[PDB]
Design a protein around this ligand. Structure first.
Ligand SMILES: Nc1ncnc2c1ncn2[C@@H]1O[C@H](COP(=O)(O)OP(=O)(O)OP(=O)(O)O)[C@@H](O)[C@H]1O
Ligand SMILES: Nc1ncnc2c1ncn2[C@@H]1O[C@H](COP(=O)(O)OP(=O)(O)OP(=O)(O)O)[C@@H](O)[C@H]1O
Lengths: 220, 286, 87, 353
């Protein structure tokens, strides 16, 4: 019954042999999970998943080893060491650089109290953003659906951008700065892939908020 | 299970170089070691191995010991460098097997389900493709003996590998290769009668010895059975070729015809072109 | 003698995200993305998302950060220096 | 207990380096095969003894050794993005027929899309071929996407969703083979359905000849047509495209074949307003004694979500009144105001035919 502690020493000693193989997860390899058996021609059975490499080459390696097939659907970002082509751990999260996080904004120096005479039309604004957070419990009872998009337009200066961001200061909402024309680059397929990343974070993250400007021009 | 084995000259040398190891210190018995096999399929292959100190007493004819501290940790050595290489059995240089060899295999069956023993030869003599291989099974017997453990012969064949012919095939340097198509096939024919009909006389004299002494082997029955398969044609007096007579020369029909047709035009290529180029240089020079 | 160090800095590579402190995913102009840790000579807090840093082509580890990410050409007509035309 | 050492022995198998994939072309002899790696170099190499006759193939993807470059075992394919196209789901059946209009358009893609799987014998016996394509434009009302979208997953769990963001790719975009790859794995699903949405971007018109970006748009169109022009599953697969206005199709896509059916949306009628109403009730509930005709009549020519917004906007006025329900007098207020504000933004509803 005490043999469990005896083998516990050799698995940690051999886990140290994994440590030198875990430094470092040298490169990124796109993962594709596959299950196939090859009759020979005695019998050799096993699970083997075809792997990619971002170098544009594609390779073939058995299923990892270490982290099992429980995670995940075919991925990327995982670390693998030089030409040995073994993946030690499945590493998140997604990509890339400014595409992942467009802008990091803590909170504005101003608050919604900075607008005079607009108290009539700020209530419509403040509602749609605030109501899905605190009042969500009342919506499941009455079957209420919170608004999503809001069109805020007026001849400049209307103080629209100051009023928008200022409402995220008191509500603790994390702000993300984004502009419409910022999605256009020389390389085609950039701003288009951004929403695939942006709205994926909208599913991952809780509002918070996202604000954009010049929707009319980009919607031409 | 194990049908045939593939013995490389590299692993066989690992038995031969150990013959220099304990040959200088002596004394009795032979060279014995544990065999590392490479099994990709029913056909067995051997790449490397490790020789272990071993001795077998005479008196005391049943006494044998492997060193298993040498077998355990050195396995983790070759396993660390080569993951595919594992122990499929053991070996020794023979030349023959004493009855004690039954106990060497049964002890190491904990390592491998069936351990194949390889009898090798350090000094090449006779009669042909050297060494030997045995497999451990139990056929009992027809006479009713208690269950009989007797090693059955496994056909052994040499095989090659990439990168291993660098130094091996270099040192000879004296061989003529081959030449296929002229001498290669005909030297075999002179030997096919020699090596074919010498075992014919060696066995037919031992088969006559059966009635005299050494019975059993009865055998039985394998001796006459395949001998009668040899009897599809005997061939005895005279050749019974009455049906194969016209067919005899009829197989030589086109072989002689082409040999007559090729040598005619090959001459026309050799004779003409030689005369042309010869007189062009010869007479135009002087 | 000084050419042997920093010789492996090829090439300039942009990082992507961070799951944990030691390991970051990085992408290089070779089109090949590289997850790697950073050498003990550079603190982990100095690595920010979108930062081009040096590399050791053998070990792929982060070597030294390079401030400029940009830009091909377009600077020479943009940059203006020296005075003229006083008040 | 000992399962950990089994994983340790699996790490010994992890020490083996991965081989390199390649595409075979043809064979000069049995001893000389011509293979081409995905990187583009071609190699005439020998082969090992463990392979079988299934390795030869007429140009099937194989893996090459890291030294002799011999083929060990052929892997069929690999795809990262496929799973993100596997997860598209839409209801109905009923929820498709609950959209309230147009009535005959629900009767269109019902027998056009869903029917071929359950009863393929009806079309082949009479001899009439089902349509291989369709086009749904807008927005005279709503329902351009939903009409094809609900019947998309109603055929079976089979669907493949295509977003216009994947066609543009990058500089020297390699998605030409990804449009082939995405449709290759679309044929992994049978019977297949193909969507195209917002083609007014990737449908670039060659009328006025612009930058080469308009050319690579046509090349991506070539990757669409090629596999759908087969030589492969054609009448079984149903392709769908959508656009804001069908002036971007060019004389090629404006023609039937590629884009076959063109269908627009109309407005509902009276006493049918009570029908589309019942399916818009859903989660939002109101006072017991009410008549919904005042609600929906004040908003005419509205999106199904716009009327759904009017129900929520009237319901979000309840929290200001600290009541669960509201009288229909305050309803019509919030209904009429917001509705008249949407009509001023209704400009540019005119679409070319
Ligand atoms: N109606 C208003 N209420 C409050 N502040 C205003 C108003 N109109 C103008 N301002 C002030 O004028 C300044 C200029 O802001 P401006 O309205 O030009 O931003 P904006 O035009 O909304 O920005 P964007 O064009 O990106 O939307 C702001 O600092 C703001 O405080
Ligand atoms: N008849 C309807 N019944 C229920 N919900 C509807 C109806 N029409 C539209 N909706 C809602 O509106 C949303 C958008 O639907 P749909 O795709 O038909 O319009 P759209 O294509 O976005 O508008 P446009 O044609 O202007 O692009 C859907 O989420 C759906 O829930």
């Amino acid at each position: 019954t005490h043999e469990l502690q005896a083998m516990k020493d050799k698995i940690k000693e051999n886990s140290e042999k994994i440590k030198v193989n875990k430094t470092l997860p040298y490169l990124v390899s796109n993962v594709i999970e596959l299950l196939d058996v090859d009759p020979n021609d005695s019998q050799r059975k096993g699970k083997c998943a075809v792997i990619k490499t971002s170098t544009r080459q594609t390779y073939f390696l058995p299923v990892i080893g270490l982290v099992d097939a429980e995670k995940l659907k075919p991925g990327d970002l995982v670390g693998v060491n030089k030409d040995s082509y073994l993946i030690l751990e499945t590493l998140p999260t997604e990509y890339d650089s400014r595409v992942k996080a467009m802008e990091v904004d803590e909170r504005p120096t101003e608050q919604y109290s900075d607008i005079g005479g607009l108290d009539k039309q700020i209530q419509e604004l403040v509602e749609a953003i605030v109501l899905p957070m605190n009042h969500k419990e009342k919506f499941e009872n009455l079957g209420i659906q919170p608004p999503k998009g809001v069109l805020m337009y007026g001849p400049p200066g209307t103080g629209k951008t100051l009023l928008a961001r200022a409402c995220a200061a008191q509500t603790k909402a994390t702000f993300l700065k984004l502009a419409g024309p910022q999605l256009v680059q020389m390389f085609i397929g950039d701003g288009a892939k951004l929403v695939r990343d942006a709205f994926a974070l909208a599913k991952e993250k809780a509002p918070s908020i996202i604000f954009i400007d010049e929707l009319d021009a980009i919607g031409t | 299970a194990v049908q045939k084995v593939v013995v490389h000259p590299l692993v066989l040398l690992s038995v031969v170089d150990h013959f220099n190891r304990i040959g200088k210190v002596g004394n009795q018995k032979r060279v014995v070691g544990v065999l590392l096999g490479s099994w990709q399929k029913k056909v067995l292959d051997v790449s490397n191995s490790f020789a272990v100190p071993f001795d077998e007493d005479d008196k005391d004819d049943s006494v044998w010991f492997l060193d298993h501290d040498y077998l355990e940790n050195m396995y983790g050595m070759f396993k660390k460098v080569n993951a595919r290489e594992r122990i499929v059995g053991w070996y020794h240089t023979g030349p023959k097997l004493h009855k004690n060899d039954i106990a060497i295999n049964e002890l190491m069956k904990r390592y491998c389900p069936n351990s194949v023993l390889v009898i090798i030869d350090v000094k090449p003599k006779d009669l042909g493709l050297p060494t030997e291989a045995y497999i451990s099974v139990e056929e009992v017997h027809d006479d009713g003996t208690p269950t009989s453990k007797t090693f059955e012969h496994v056909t052994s064949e040499i095989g090659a590998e990439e990168a291993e012919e660098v130094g091996v095939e270099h040192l000879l340097r004296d061989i003529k290769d081959t030449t296929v198509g002229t001498l290669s096939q005909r030297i075999t024919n002179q030997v096919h009668g020699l090596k074919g009909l010498n075992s014919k006389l060696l066995d037919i004299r031992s088969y006559l010895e059966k009635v005299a002494t050494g019975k059993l082997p009865i055998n039985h029955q394998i001796i006459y059975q395949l001998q009668d398969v040899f009897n599809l044609l005997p061939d005895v007096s005279l050749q019974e070729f009455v049906k194969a007579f016209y067919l005899k020369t009829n197989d030589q029909m086109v072989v002689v015809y082409l040999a007559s047709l090729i040598r005619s035009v090959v001459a026309l290529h050799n004779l003409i072109n030689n005369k042309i180029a010869n007189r062009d240089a010869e007479k135009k020079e002087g | 003698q000084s050419e042997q160090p920093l010789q492996v800095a090829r090439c300039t590579k942009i990082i992507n995200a961070d799951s944990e402190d030691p390991k970051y995913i990085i992408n290089v102009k070779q089109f090949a993305k590289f997850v790697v840790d950073l050498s003990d000579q550079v603190a982990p807090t100095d690595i920010e998302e979108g930062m081009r840093v040096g590399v050791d082509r053998n070990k792929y580890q982060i070597h030294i950060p390079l401030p400029p990410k940009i830009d091909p050409t377009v600077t020479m007509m943009q940059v203006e220096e020296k005075p003229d035309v006083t008040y | 207990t000992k399962q950990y050492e089994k994983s340790e022995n699996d790490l010994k198998a992890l020490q083996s380096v991965g081989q390199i994939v390649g595409e075979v072309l043809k064979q000069l002899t049995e001893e000389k095969f011509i293979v081409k790696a995905t990187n583009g170099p071609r190699y005439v190499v020998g082969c090992r003894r463990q392979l079988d006759k299934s390795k030869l193939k007429p140009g099937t993807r194989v893996a090459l050794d890291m030294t002799t470059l011999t083929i060990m075992r052929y892997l069929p394919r690999e795809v990262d993005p496929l799973v993100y196209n596997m997860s598209h789901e839409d209801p109905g059946n009923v929820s498709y027929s609950e959209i309230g209009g147009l009535s005959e358009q629900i009767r269109e893609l019902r027998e056009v899309i869903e029917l071929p799987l359950t009863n393929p014998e009806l079309f082949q016996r009479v001899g009439i071929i089902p349509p291989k394509g369709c086009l749904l434009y807008g927005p005279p009302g709503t329902g351009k996407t939903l009409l094809a979208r609900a019947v998309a997953s109603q055929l079976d769990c089979n669907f493949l969703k295509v977003v216009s963001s994947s066609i543009v790719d990058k500089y020297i975009g390699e998605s030409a083979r990804l449009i082939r790859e995405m449709f290759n794995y679309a044929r992994d699903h049978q019977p297949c359905i193909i969507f195209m949405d917002e083609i007014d971007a990737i449908g670039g018109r060659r009328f006025s000849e612009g930058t080469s970006a308009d050319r690579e748009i046509q090349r991506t169109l070539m990757e669409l047509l090629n596999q759908m022009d087969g030589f492969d599953t054609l009448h079984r697969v149903k392709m769908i495209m959508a656009t804001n206005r069908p002036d971007t199709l060019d004389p090629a896509l404006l023609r039937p074949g590629r884009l076959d059916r063109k269908i627009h949306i109309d407005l509902p009628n009276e006493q049918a307003r009570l029908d589309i109403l019942k399916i818009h009730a859903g989660p939002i509930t109101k006072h017991g004694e009410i008549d919904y005709e005042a609600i929906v009549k004040l908003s005419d020519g509205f999106n199904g979500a716009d009327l759904r917004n009017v129900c929520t906007e009237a319901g979000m006025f309840a929290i200001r009144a600290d009541h669960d329900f509201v009288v229909q007098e305050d309803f019509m207020k919030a209904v009429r105001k917001v509705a008249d504000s949407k009509k001023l933004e209704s400009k540019l509803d005119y679409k070319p035919v």
